[PDB]
C-alpha cells in the first residue's frame, strides 16, 4: 500500500512485456484497431522478502489487493483496458512477478499515399507517473515480447513486433514521466485488388476506345456514354475504400485520368462528326487514324509517369 | 471532510486547466464527439498548513478520501464522465494541487451551411457545486491549458484551444453558480473534394452541352438523357458521404441548379427539332447558335451569384 | 433516512418539473429516441426541517445519502435512467429543492403520414413508488417546466412543453393514478424538402412528357424508357433518407401515381405508332394533340384530390 | 435468505404471469425481437408473519435483498434481463406480491413461406431449478397475463397472448427442471406491400410486352433490354426484405418467373427479326400475332398455379 | 478455499462438459459469433466427507463460498464470459460436482474459398489456472457434452459437436498447462443461391450472346453494352450480401471470367462490322458463324477447369 523508500537516490525500475494474442477489426476510416494480449510486469521490493529455509517455501503467492502494484496506463486508447489478474508471486530476495490479460481499442494514424500497395506501422504507448517521492522508470524484457503463430489480421501480413528499449522522458503537469513505444509493422495483401478492381476498368476503357474504328454517329455516342455510365457505377462500387485525405493518392489520380480520357474521347467524336457533315471526309479520316494510335500510347506514358511519381 | 472556513473572508478561487490528449469520433448525425484529456485544479486551504520540516518539501499524498475536494461537473455530456485520481499534492503555504483523467462524450451543434469550406467550433462547459458556508468561483490558468501535438481528427486540422469566462446564473437557475467555457476551433481540409466531386460534375455537364453542335435528334436525345442518368448516379455517390441536414446548403443549391439546366437543355432540343420539322431551318439554326454561348455564360453568372450570396 | 411522518393526515404532494436540454439521437426506424434533460422536484418536509434558525439562514446544501429522496420511475424507458444529481438546496423552512440531469432512451409512437408536413407529439410517463406511510400524490410545477431556448433538435421547431396528470391504471393499487404525462409538440421544417425532392421529380416527368411534340418512334421510345430508368434511380436515392414505414404515405401515393402515368404514356405512344403504321394519320394526330392537353390537367386534378383526401 | 422451511413433504410451487407493455424492433435478419414487460410472482413462506393482533397494517412493504426470492431465468434470451424491483409486499397470511419490470431481446425462428401474407408465433420460455431437497414447480396465474390497449408493433397485428398451463418436466445435467411456454401470435399487414412492390413490376412487365405491336428491330431491342435493366434496379431497391432461407418463398418464385419471361421475350424478338431478314415475312407476322395473345394467358395461368401451390 | 493435498500419484483431474443451448449472430467481417451454453465440472477432493452414519441421511451438501473451486478461463474470447453459479453438490465419498451458465463472444478464423458450397469449423479453447501445491489437468465427459435441439443458425446446419485434448505447454510459456478444443462443424445451405444468383446471370449472358445472329451494328452495340451495365448492377446486388474477402475466391473468378467474355464479344462485334464495311462479307460471315459455336464451348470448358481447380 506504500511505495518502497529509496536507499540514497536511486529510482525504481519496472520490467514490462506484451505478448499479442489476436488483432482484428482494423477500421480504415476510423483509424483504429482492436487487440487482446498478455501484460507482464516485474519489480523489486525488499520490504517483502521472506525466509525460505524458515518458512520451508521458495515462492509465496498473494492476491491482487493489499499489495503495491504500480499503475500502468495506455495513452492512445478510447477507453481504459478491461483487466483481470492471473498471478502474483514473490521471490525470496523480494522481486515481484505479475501477469494479466487485457483488451482495448487503439488509436493510430495511417498513410494512404500508396493505398493498394501500402505499408503501415501501429504504435502502442505505455506510461507511468512519478508516484510519491520515488521516481519510476520503465524497462523492456526482451524475453516477454512476442506474438502467437495464430495471430491473423484479415488481408494483412505481420512483419515484426518490437519495442523501443530506450523510453522518452519529460515533465508533464509538473511531474516527471516515462513513455514506452511498441511498434507493429504490417503490409497489405494486394493480390486480390488486381482482378476485382484494376482489370475491369481497363476492359471498360478499351470498350470505350473501340469506337475509333467506326463511322456511324449514334453507335459511337451510345458506346462512349454507356461506357462512362458503367465507369461511374464501378466507382460507386469501389467507393467502399480509403477515406478523405489531405493528399492525393494513387487511385484518385488514376480515376481522374480516366475521367479526363473519357472527356477527350467525347470531344474527338464530336469533332469528327462535325467535320464529316461539312463535306471534308479527308480531315475526319486523318483525325480518326491519328487518334487510333495516339490514345493508347498517351495512356501508357501517363501511367508510367504516375508510377514513377508515386514510387520513386 | 468539511468545507474550508472563510477566515480570510475571501472567495475560494480555483485554477482550472484542461490538457487534451486526443479527440476522435466526430459524429455528424448525433451532433457529438468524444474526448480524452486531463484536468488540473488548484485552490487555497490554510486549514492544513505544513510549515515544519517533517518530510520533504512535497508534503502531499493525502488520499482522495478524508479531504475536501470541490466537485466539478460537465454540462453538455451524454453520460457522466469517468474519473480516476492521479495526484494529490499540498504546498506548505496552503494551496492544494489536484489532477485527474477522464473520457466523455460532448454534445455541441454544427452548421453545414458551407459544407466543403466550413469551419466549426466545439464547446465544453464547466460548473462547480456551491457550498453552504463559503463561495467558490472559477478561474483559468494560462500555463495549464494546452493540447498535445498528437491530436488528430479524420479530415480536420486543429487551430486553437482557448478558455473564456461566462457570467453566472445561467437559464432560470440562480443559485450563484458560475460556469466556464472551452472552445476548440477546427477547419476542414477541402483540397480532396475538388478532384473527387467538382471536376467530374463539370465534365459531365460539358459532355451534355456538346449536343448543340449537332442536328440529329436521336443522338441529341440519347446524349442529354444518358447524361442526366449519369448525373443522378453521381448525386447518389455524393450524397453517400454528405451528412443529412434538414436545411439548404451550398451543394444542394448547386445540384438543384444543375437539374434546372438539364431541363432547359431538353426544352431547347425539343424546340429546335419542332422548328426544323415545320420547314423553318433558319430560326432553328439561330436559336442553337444563340444557345451555344448563352448556356455557359448564364451558368457562370449563376455560380458567381450563389458564391457571393452564401459567402457574404 | 426515513420518509417524513404524517402530521395531520395531509398527503405528501410532490411538485415535479422537467427542464429540457437536448432532444437528439433518433435511432432505429423512428421508434427509439434519446433525451438529455434536467429534472426538478420540490416536496415539503415540514416538522423535519434541518437547523432552522435566522443565524443559520444560509441555504443548506446536502448529499444524496443525507435526506429522503423519493423514487420515481419512467414507464416507457428501455433501461433504467442514469441518475446524476447536480445540487441539493434545503431551505430552513419545510421545503426542499432538487435538480438532476439524466439521459435515457425513450420509446414513443411516430406517425409518418403527411411525412413532409407532419407534427409529432412525444410522451413521457412518470410514476412514484408508494411507501408504508400515506399515499404520495403527484402535481405539476409550472414555474420549473420549460426548455432552455437552445434545444438541438435539428429539423424540428418546438411548439410547446406542457404537463397533465392523466388518470390511469396498469396492474393493481388503490390509487395507481399518480401518473404524469409530458407532451412535447414539435413540427418539421419542410422548406428544404421541396427543392431536395419534389422539383426534380416534376422536371423528370416533364422531360418524359416532351415526347408528345414528336413523331419519331425511336426517339419517343428512348425518351420515355430512359426517363423511367432515371425515375427508378431517383426513387432509390430518395428512399435512403426515410425510415421504414409499413403503411401508406403521401409520398408513396405520389410515387405510385407517377408510375401509373408512365405506363399510360407508353400505351399512348404505342397506340399512336400503330395507327400511323396502319395509315390513319388524322386519328394519330388527333390522339396526340388531345393527349398534349389531357395529361397535365389530369395530373393536377389527381394531385389536388390526393392532397384534399390526405390532409383532411 | 434461505428457501422456505418445508411444513410438509409437498413440493413448493410458484405461480407467475407476464404483462406486456410494448413490442418493438422485430428484426427478421437475426430472427429476434425486443420487449419489455411486468413480471409478477407469488409464493408462500411461514418465515414471514404479519401482526393483526398489533393493530395491523395493509401494505408493509419490504426490500428485495432482505428476503429469499426464487431464481427465475429465461431460456432463449440474449443475456440476463434488466430487472429492477418496483413493488414487493406481504399480507397477513404471508403471500408475497412481487412485481418487477424487465427488458430483454428474444430469439425465435420465423417462417417466410408466404412472406407478404404470413403469420408467425413467438415463444418465451421460463425455467426454474430444483434447489436443495425441496422440489419446485411452476404454475400459471391467468389473472396476471395479458397486454394493454397500447401494445402496438409497427406493421403487425396482435392476435393473442396465452400461456400453456401444463409444463414439460425433463432431466438435464442430473437434475429435474420445469419449463413454461408463452406464445404471442401475430399477423402481418399486407395492404401497403401491393402498391409499393407488386404493381410497379407488373407495369414494367407490360411495358416490356408492348413490343409485340411493332416491327422495328432497334426499338424492340431497346424496349426489352432497358425494361430488363429497370427490373434489375427495382430488385436492387426491393432487396431490403426477407433474408436467405433454406426453402423457397412466394416472391422469389414470382421474380424467377419474371426473369424467365424476359428471356423468352428476347428469344422471340430475335427469332422474328431473323425470319424477317430471310424473306419469310408471313411466318414472322403469324408468330408475332400468336405471341400477342399467348404471353398474357400463360402469365395468368402460371400465377394461378403458383397461388394454388403455395396458399392451397 | 485451500488447494487439494497432493496425496495420490496422479494429479487432480477435472471433467469438463459443455451443453449448447443456442448460437446466434454469426458476423463474418469480424469473424465472430456469440454463444449461450452450460458448463459442468467435476473433481474428487478427500479433505471433506459426509458419512452415511450418525444421521447421514443427507447425501448431498452445498458450499457457496466455503469451498475451493478451480477456475476456468477462455482464450479466444473477446470479453470475459458472464457466468453465474447454478448449483454445487458434494458426494458423501468426496467427488464434487459443479455447474454454471455463461454467454460470451468467440473469435474464430473463417475460409470463404468455396463461398456458396463451403463448410466451416468453430473452435472454443479452455485453460486451467495451475495451483501451487497440486497439479491439475483437464478431461472430457462425453455424457456432459451435447446441444439442445432448439439450436439454430440462419443459413447453416450443424453436423456435430465434439471435444478433444490439445497438447500441454501452449505458446511460449511451458508451465505445465493444458488446453481443450471444442469442435463445431457446420455447413452452408445453398439451395436458395442457385435461383437467386446463378440463373439470372446466365440468362443475361445468353441474352448478350444473341448478337451473333444479327447484322445491324446499332442493335449489336446496344445489346452488348446494355447487358454489360446490367451485369454490373447485378454484381452490386450480389456483393451487397457478401462479406468482404481480401483474397481470391470462386465467385470472384467467375465474375472476372464473365468480364473477359464481355470484352471479347465487343471485340468480335467490332471486327465483324469493320470487315463488312470494306466489302469482304464472306470473311465476316465465317467469323460470326465460327463464334456462334466457339463461345459456349469455351465457356463450358473454362467453368469445368475452374470447378476442378477449386474443388480438387
Ligand atoms: C466552358 C466551355 C466548355 C463548353 C462545353 C462544350 C465543349 C464542346 C466543344 C465543341 C465541339 C467541337 C467543336 C467543333 O466541331 O469544331 C470544329 C471546327 C472546325 O470547323 P471549320 O471547318 O474550321 O469551321 O473547329 C475545330 O476543329 C475545333 C477543334 C478543337 C475544339 C475543342 C477544344 C476544346 C473545347 C473547349 C473545352 C473546354 C474545357
Ligand atoms: C408542363 C409540360 C411541359 C411539356 C414540355 C413542353 C415542350 C415545349 C415544346 C413546344 C414546341 O416545340 O413549340 C415550338 C413552337 C412552334 O411555333 P409555331 O407555331 O410553329 O411558330 O415555337 C415556340 O413556341 C417558340 C419557343 C417557345 C417555347 C416555350 C416553352 C416553355 C415551356 C415551359 C414549361 C413549364
Ligand atoms: C465559351 C466557349 C464555348 C463557346 C464558344 C463560342 C462559339 C463560337 C461559334 O459558334 O463559332 C462557330 C464557328 C463555325 O460555325 P458557324 O458560325 O455556323 O460557321 O466556329 C466553330 O465551330 C468554333 C469551334 C470551336 C469552339 C470551341 C468550344
Ligand atoms: C391493360 C391495358 C390494356 C390496353 C388499354 C388501352 C387500349 C388502347 C387501344 C384501344 C384499341 C384501339 O384504339 O385500337 C387501335 C389499334 C388497332 O385498332 P384498328 O382496328 O387498327 O383501329 O390498336 C392498337 O393500337 C394496339 C395498341 C397496343 C397496346 C396495348 C397492349 C399493351 C401490352 C399488353 C397489356 C396486357 C395487360 C393484361
Ligand atoms: C410548384 C409545385 C411544388 C411545390 C408544392 C408545395 C408548395 C408549398 C406548400 C405549402 C405548405 C403549407 O402551406 O404548409 C404546410 C401545410 C400544413 O398542413 P395543415 O395544417 O394540414 O394545412 C392546413 C392549412 N393549410 O400543408 C399543406 O397545406 C400542404 C399542401 C400540399 C400541396 C401539394 C404539394 C405536393 C406537390 C407535388
Ligand atoms: C391481352 C389481349 C391481347 C390482344 C389480343 C387481341 C389481338 O390480337 O388484337 C389485335 C387486333 C387485330 O389485329 P391483327 O393481329 O392483324 O388481327 O388489333 C389490335 O391491336 C386491336 C387492339 C387490341 C388491344 C388489346 C388490349 C389488351
Ligand atoms: C446455352 C446455349 C445457348 C446460348 C444462347 C443462345 C441464344 C440463341 C437463341 C436462338 C436465336 C434465334 C435463332 C433463329 O434465328 O432461328 C430461326 C430459325 C428459322 O429458320 P429454319 O427454317 O429453322 O432454319 O430456327 C428457328 O425457328 C429456331 C426456333 C427455336 C429457337 C429458340 C430455341 C431456344 C434456344 C435455347 C437457349 C438455351 C436454353
Ligand atoms: C490486350 C489487348 C487485346 C486486344 C488487341 C486487339 C485484338 C483483336 C484484333 C484481332 C484481329 C486483328 C486483325 C484483323 O483481322 O482485323 C481486321 C481489320 C484489319 O485487318 P486487315 O489487314 O484488313 O485484315 O482490323 C480490325 O477490324 C480492327 C478492329 C480493332 C478492334 C480492337 C480494338 C481494341 C481497343 C484498343 C485496345 C488497346 C490495347 C492496349
Ligand atoms: C449450343 C447451342 C447454340 C448454338 C447452336 C449451333 C449453331 C447452329 C447454327 O448456326 O445454325 C444456323 C442455321 C441457319 O443459319 P445459316 O448458317 O445461315 O443457315 O440454323 C439455325 O438458325 C438454327 C439455330 C438454332 C439455335 C438453337 C439454340
mmCIF file of N, CA, C and O and ligand atoms in Angstrom, chain D residues 274 278, chain E residues 213 289 292-293 296, ligand 9:
data_model
loop_
_atom_site.group_PDB
_atom_site.id
_atom_site.type_symbol
_atom_site.label_atom_id
_atom_site.label_comp_id
_atom_site.label_asym_id
_atom_site.label_seq_id
_atom_site.Cartn_x
_atom_site.Cartn_y
_atom_site.Cartn_z
ATOM 1 N N UNK D 274 -34.874 -12.418 -87.360
ATOM 2 C CA UNK D 274 -34.148 -13.323 -88.244
ATOM 3 C C UNK D 274 -35.048 -13.842 -89.356
ATOM 4 O O UNK D 274 -34.620 -13.953 -90.510
ATOM 5 N N UNK D 278 -34.785 -13.184 -93.601
ATOM 6 C CA UNK D 278 -34.697 -14.323 -94.509
ATOM 7 C C UNK D 278 -35.823 -14.365 -95.540
ATOM 8 O O UNK D 278 -36.054 -15.426 -96.133
ATOM 9 N N UNK E 213 -26.448 -13.461 -84.196
ATOM 10 C CA UNK E 213 -27.467 -13.791 -85.181
ATOM 11 C C UNK E 213 -28.009 -12.557 -85.888
ATOM 12 O O UNK E 213 -29.104 -12.606 -86.456
ATOM 13 N N UNK E 289 -20.184 -17.073 -87.822
ATOM 14 C CA UNK E 289 -20.620 -18.463 -87.750
ATOM 15 C C UNK E 289 -19.716 -19.277 -86.836
ATOM 16 O O UNK E 289 -20.193 -20.121 -86.070
ATOM 17 N N UNK E 292 -20.442 -18.309 -83.110
ATOM 18 C CA UNK E 292 -21.701 -18.853 -82.601
ATOM 19 C C UNK E 292 -21.488 -20.160 -81.850
ATOM 20 O O UNK E 292 -22.101 -20.392 -80.802
ATOM 21 N N UNK E 293 -20.628 -21.027 -82.374
ATOM 22 C CA UNK E 293 -20.353 -22.296 -81.715
ATOM 23 C C UNK E 293 -19.181 -22.184 -80.744
ATOM 24 O O UNK E 293 -19.165 -22.869 -79.716
ATOM 25 N N UNK E 296 -19.985 -20.744 -76.467
ATOM 26 C CA UNK E 296 -20.483 -21.604 -75.377
ATOM 27 C C UNK E 296 -19.535 -22.731 -75.000
ATOM 28 O O UNK E 296 -19.429 -23.075 -73.815
HETATM 29 C C1 LIG F 9 -25.019 -24.663 -78.498
HETATM 30 C C2 LIG F 9 -26.428 -24.168 -78.805
HETATM 31 C C3 LIG F 9 -26.422 -22.866 -79.595
HETATM 32 C C4 LIG F 9 -25.631 -22.926 -80.895
HETATM 33 C C5 LIG F 9 -26.219 -23.923 -81.884
HETATM 34 C C6 LIG F 9 -25.329 -24.210 -83.086
HETATM 35 C C7 LIG F 9 -25.470 -23.160 -84.180
HETATM 36 C C8 LIG F 9 -26.487 -23.540 -85.244
HETATM 37 C C9 LIG F 9 -26.401 -22.659 -86.459
HETATM 38 O O1 LIG F 9 -25.504 -21.883 -86.678
HETATM 39 O O2 LIG F 9 -27.433 -22.832 -87.275
HETATM 40 C C10 LIG F 9 -27.715 -21.801 -88.210
HETATM 41 C C11 LIG F 9 -28.825 -22.230 -89.146
HETATM 42 C C12 LIG F 9 -29.259 -21.189 -90.164
HETATM 43 O O3 LIG F 9 -28.301 -20.165 -90.331
HETATM 44 P P1 LIG F 9 -27.236 -20.292 -91.567
HETATM 45 O O4 LIG F 9 -25.996 -20.989 -91.101
HETATM 46 O O5 LIG F 9 -27.117 -19.010 -92.333
HETATM 47 O O6 LIG F 9 -28.183 -21.353 -92.408
HETATM 48 O O7 LIG F 9 -29.925 -22.706 -88.356
HETATM 49 C C13 LIG F 9 -30.371 -22.008 -87.309
HETATM 50 O O8 LIG F 9 -30.595 -20.823 -87.328
HETATM 51 C C14 LIG F 9 -30.544 -22.888 -86.103
HETATM 52 C C15 LIG F 9 -30.483 -22.118 -84.791
HETATM 53 C C16 LIG F 9 -30.875 -22.979 -83.598
HETATM 54 C C17 LIG F 9 -30.378 -22.400 -82.281
HETATM 55 C C18 LIG F 9 -30.903 -23.137 -81.057
HETATM 56 C C19 LIG F 9 -30.156 -22.762 -79.783
#
